[PDB]
């Protein structure tokens, strides 16, 4: 068996030669260049919208791409569509098992996706001839639970699941046509590019991985949480993203330069990260700590600049339109609220 | 007001689409749900096929007894890591766990010196001693008796507890067993355990479980009157 | 998708009979339904109009308090009642389906209709032309003069377009003010300013050809047009 243990030393040598490389080409921190800038004074943002109706906790809200319709799950097994504008509902669509933990909204506004605890992603169609909302699709091919699922395209989905994998499908054969694997722990967030042809997963053992949709194979890898993963996000311009914990601590990580950048830890926080989503420019960086509030976390400066603190229980999603003209947050008092 | 002529229409499916939200959550907000745990083989498939049933992942059971609807969560076929996925059944009202007695004397597949019995019984410490279920209640079974009987008087007690000093019986080795079980509760003033040792007939399993729902259900509704 | 209409016939003043009209294809439970009369040779005019459950309707002043209107969702019918009918509502009867929220297209579709024959302020809109002689393979523009703003502060207006065909019920083009139905090719388009709207065709084909209606949707008493006749 000494093939094993000349493989782990060849292993052990190899990461010990890229953590060299990696720290080497490092000259200056980010937030010493960033010191001769002015900071945002004071992130004042007041409630809206208070969208109400659920009866349980919510677990997923997606935005559309026009800013005007969003998508909710919540564990009663409804899936109702919202208009942001006039607090109007647009549909209350059921699910067949009220155990949903993901939830998404396709580009063009056709179709919408949803996965839950029976290892089982269901995709309806709101544009059908008559006048309810039908099953498209129903995709089985997991074997643990289902975290999040993201719609490259309006034909292809891809999905994270909870036995240390991921899967790129296709709808209208129904059978998945790439399997990316390699993470050791359960993959429960991922996200996609915004040019929609690389994304990001991170494993439950800290631990992110870069994946391509073309090859199917791990580009690069990112490590320094302690704790786990709990939530990715891109960066605007695509060159960076932003990963959350549990630990209290959230980072910024390069794609060009695999290395971390920067860390928002604050010594007054002991409580984990649900959410992470940035802004229409990438300059702040929301936070939802399950301490009944958020954060307005600055991207350049680490400092806090605003807390929304309007929330009753643990807030366990928020989102930022596309336009980044209002953000949406929704927690485990089955309130949704808007915040311009 | 100031809304237009269509306008006035979506608000008045708004309507409808809210009330039709509220009239099914009245309807599944007054049936008992309860979660189902235990090892591999702890007759948990017998426990649900012995009661009475009507209806990968997660799988459901539904049925009814005496004007009660009681719904039961049998999540066994998730191999995920359960600290993950058990803050979805924060809001439950029991949690039937399946022990066996006569798995004492078989010791663990893939190990030959770490036994069963204690790994039911640091389960059980761990369910019980959760963050999140912290006021609900426990009923527990001990499914196998016959065997257990067989093989306690064949085989002596103190293969699987090394401190015994009671006679090689089953009287007395059951109540040892309970003893050792309930005494795994470290909230013992907020949460109560209902042991019971199933039998072969569905009514008395089926009688104990409703019997066990409502003094919860009673205890509940004197909990929300500050009236205890 | 489909909806039948039945009880018409010849009938004498002083009293009437029922008109029921039967769906099949879709849920009929979430869809208003709208009554539309259409005179012999003339122009097309609205009748009633009664919402989803049956929880606000709507006449015209013409016909107010002598019409009626019920639902049935079980079997999925849809009642009209006739008191007392004069010699001028011998005509055409259509029964139209529409829906409304964000992003819907109300009277998508309108029917087949039945006839009935007896024995013996609000918005003004105008046609252009009566009649327009064009050869195939030419763009025509159809205009409509409204005698109100039909913008609203939202920001849409609420003027539709129907095509009819000799020999069959319209059909929709394009809803609200320029956005094309589903259906009907991209050769259609529509523009407007708040007034006077205008239709648009890239090339005529020998089966677009008929009479084009437009009408308006600001307000509850609707209203449609005379009705531009296109010929080959």
């Known amino acids: 068996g000494s093939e094993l243990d000349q493989l782990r030393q060849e292993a052990e040598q190899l990461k010990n030669q890229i953590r060299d490389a990696r720290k080497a080409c490092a000259d200056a921190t980010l937030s010493q260049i960033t010191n001769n800038i002015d900071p945002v004074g004071r992130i004042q943002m007041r409630t809206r919208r208070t969208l109400r109706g659920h009866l349980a906790k919510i677990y997923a809200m997606h935005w559309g791409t026009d800013s005007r319709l969003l998508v909710s799950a919540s564990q009663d097994g409804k899936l109702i569509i919202w208009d942001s504008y006039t607090t109007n509902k647009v549909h209350a669509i059921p699910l067949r098992s009220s155990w949903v933990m993901t939830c998404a909204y396709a580009p063009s506004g056709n179709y919408v996706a949803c996965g839950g605890l029976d290892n089982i992603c269901s995709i309806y169609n709101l544009k059908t001839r008559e006048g309810n909302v039908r099953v498209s699709r129903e995709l089985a091919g997991h074997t643990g639970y289902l975290s999040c699922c993201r719609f490259l395209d309006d034909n292809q989905i891809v999905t994270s699941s909870g036995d240390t994998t991921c899967a790129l499908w296709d709808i209208e054969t129904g059978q998945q046509t790439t399997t990316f694997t390699g993470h050791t722990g359960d993959v429960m967030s991922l996200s996609l590019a915004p040019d929609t042809r690389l994304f990001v997963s991170g494993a439950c053992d800290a631990s992110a991985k870069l994946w391509d949709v073309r090859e199917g194979m791990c580009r690069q890898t990112f490590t320094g949480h302690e704790s786990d993963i709990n939530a990715i996000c891109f960066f605007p311009n695509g060159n960076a993203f932003a990963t959350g914990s549990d630990d209290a601590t959230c980072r910024l990580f390069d794609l060009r330069a695999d290395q971390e950048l920067m860390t928002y830890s604050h010594d007054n926080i002991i409580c984990g990260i649900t959410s992470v989503s940035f802004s229409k420019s990438g300059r702040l960086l929301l936070a939802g700590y399950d301490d009944f509030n958020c954060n307005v976390w600055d991207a350049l400066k680490a400092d806090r600049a605003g807390v929304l603190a309007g929330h009753d229980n643990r807030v366990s999603c928020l989102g930022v339109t596309d336009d980044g003209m209002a953000v949406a947050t929704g927690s485990w008092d089955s309130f949704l609220k808007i915040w311009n | 007001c100031t809304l237009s002529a269509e306008d006035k229409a979506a608000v008045e499916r708004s309507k409808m689409i809210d009330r039709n939200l509220r009239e099914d959550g009245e309807k599944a907000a007054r049936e008992v749900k309860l979660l189902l745990l235990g090892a591999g083989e702890s007759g948990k498939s017998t426990i649900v096929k012995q009661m009475k049933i009507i209806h990968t992942g997660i799988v459901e059971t539904h049925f009814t007894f005496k004007d009660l609807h009681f719904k039961m969560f049998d999540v066994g076929g998730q191999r995920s890591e359960r600290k993950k996925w058990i803050h979805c059944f924060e809001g439950v009202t029991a949690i039937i766990f399946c022990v066996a007695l006569s798995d004492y004397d078989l010791v663990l597949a893939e190990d030959e010196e770490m036994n069963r019995m204690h790994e039911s019984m640091k389960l059980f410490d761990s369910i019980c001693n959760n963050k999140w279920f912290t006021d609900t209640s426990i009923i527990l079974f001990l499914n196998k008796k016959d065997l257990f009987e067989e093989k306690i008087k064949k085989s002596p007690l103190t293969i699987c507890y090394p401190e015994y000093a009671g006679s090689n019986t089953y009287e007395e080795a059951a109540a040892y067993i309970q003893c050792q079980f309930e005494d795994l509760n470290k909230r013992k003033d907020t949460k109560e355990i209902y042991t019971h040792f199933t039998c072969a007939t569905d009514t008395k399993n089926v009688q104990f479980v409703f019997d066990a729902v409502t003094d919860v259900i009673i205890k509940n509704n004197l909990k929300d009157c500050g009236l205890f | 998708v489909q909806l039948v209409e039945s009880g018409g016939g010849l009938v004498q003043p002083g009293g009437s009979r029922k008109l029921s009209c039967s769906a099949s294809?879709?849920?009929?439970?979430?869809?208003?339904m709208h009554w539309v009369r259409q005179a012999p040779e003339k122009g097309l005019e609205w009748v009633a109009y009664?919402?989803?459950?049956?929880?606000?309707?709507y006449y015209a002043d013409t016909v107010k308090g002598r019409f009626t209107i019920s639902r049935d969702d079980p079997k999925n019918t849809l009642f009209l009642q006739m008191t007392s009918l004069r010699s001028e509502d011998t005509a055409m009867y259509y029964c139209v389906r529409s829906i409304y929220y964000y992003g819907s297209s109300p009277f998508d579709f309108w029917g087949q209709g039945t006839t009935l024959t007896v024995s013996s302020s609000d918005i003004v809109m105008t046609q252009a032309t009566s009649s327009v002689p064009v050869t195939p393979g030419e763009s025509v523009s159809i205009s409509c003069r409204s005698s109100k703003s039909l913008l609203h502060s939202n920001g849409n207006t609420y003027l539709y377009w129907f095509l009819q065909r000799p020999g069959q019920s319209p059909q929709l083009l394009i809803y609200?003010?320029?956005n094309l139905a589903s259906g009907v090719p991209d050769r259609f388009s529509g523009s407007g300013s708040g007034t006077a709207f205008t239709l648009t065709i890239s090339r005529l084909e020998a089966e677009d050809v008929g009479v084009y209606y437009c009408?308006?949707?600001?307000?509850?008493?609707?209203?449609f047009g005379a009705g531009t006749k296109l010929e080959l």
């Open positions: 009664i919402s989803s459950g049956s929880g606000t309707i």
């Open positions: 294809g879709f849920a009929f439970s979430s869809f208003g």
């Open positions: 009408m308006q949707h600001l307000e509850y008493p609707l209203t």
């Open positions: 609200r003010m320029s």
